[PDB]
Design a protein around this nucleic acid. Structure first.
Length: 211
DNA sequence: TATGTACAACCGAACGTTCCATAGCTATTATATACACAGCGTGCT
């Protein structure tokens, strides 16, 4: 995106991820990295230790914290202190977290400059309109009976795999595919994700996947 | 505090056979000459 929208020459851009760790040697350049590769404290590899020293030694002029709703976490906030910078910007669509650490952003990166409405940009053609829906798949009699006895932690897997949900997902997928739509099926539970994918013969992605 | 989930690190060529082109040898006739050799025929024993 940086290359496409502005005239940033590729020579001055270095991506510090788990794959490649080379750093730009030109006087002034750009580093696009991740919190996991910059907030680590205990164990850094030899290849990743020179890069971190390269980041720390120089006095940067600007830091862009994408998805800044995770910076006030227990350890991610450490990067805001270690990295030297005279300007800090936070970019996030959602500025909410379950705990009370959201307010910590004030003394980490500063105040909230601007906010934008969602419907205003939707009616102006800048973002798409969505008809949100919530389908009620009544649990079948057989599955439901077990839901009463089982404990909290297993009850989750029980009400995620009820057959009616399989039928509803299969019907919607077929209906929208006929409409020439590209569908995404989210699932935080990996076992259900694999079971659904192998049952419908569709690709799936989860945490164990190589980049 | 515990459990999920996520992330980072440790195959050639020699020889043989046939085909043009030029020049030279072979055979025949006559004659004188004379030598050596290979025959045939007649008398002797």
């Amino acid at each position: 995106q940086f290359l496409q929208w502005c005239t940033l020459q590729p020579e001055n851009c270095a991506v510090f991820t788990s794959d490649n760790k080379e750093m730009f040697q030109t006087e002034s350049g750009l580093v696009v990295s991740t919190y996991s590769m910059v907030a680590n404290t205990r164990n850094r590899s030899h290849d990743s230790q020179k890069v971190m020293d390269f980041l720390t030694g120089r006095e940067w002029g600007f830091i862009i914290l994408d998805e800044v709703h995770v910076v006030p976490a227990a350890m991610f906030r450490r990067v805001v202190s270690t990295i030297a910078a005279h300007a800090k910007l936070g970019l996030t669509a959602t500025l909410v977290r379950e705990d009370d650490k959201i307010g910590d952003l004030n003394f980490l990166i500063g105040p909230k400059l601007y906010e934008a409405n969602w419907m205003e940009l939707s009616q102006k053609g800048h973002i798409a309109n969505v008809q949100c829906a919530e389908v009620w798949c009544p649990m079948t009699a057989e599955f439901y009976q077990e839901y009463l006895r089982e404990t909290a932690r297993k009850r989750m897997l029980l009400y995620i795999m009820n057959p009616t949900k399989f039928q509803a997902c299969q019907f919607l997928i077929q209906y929208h595919e006929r409409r020439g739509d590209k569908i995404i099926v989210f699932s935080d539970n990996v076992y259900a994700l694999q079971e659904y994918a192998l049952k419908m013969g569709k690709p799936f992605i989860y945490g164990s996947t190589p980049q």
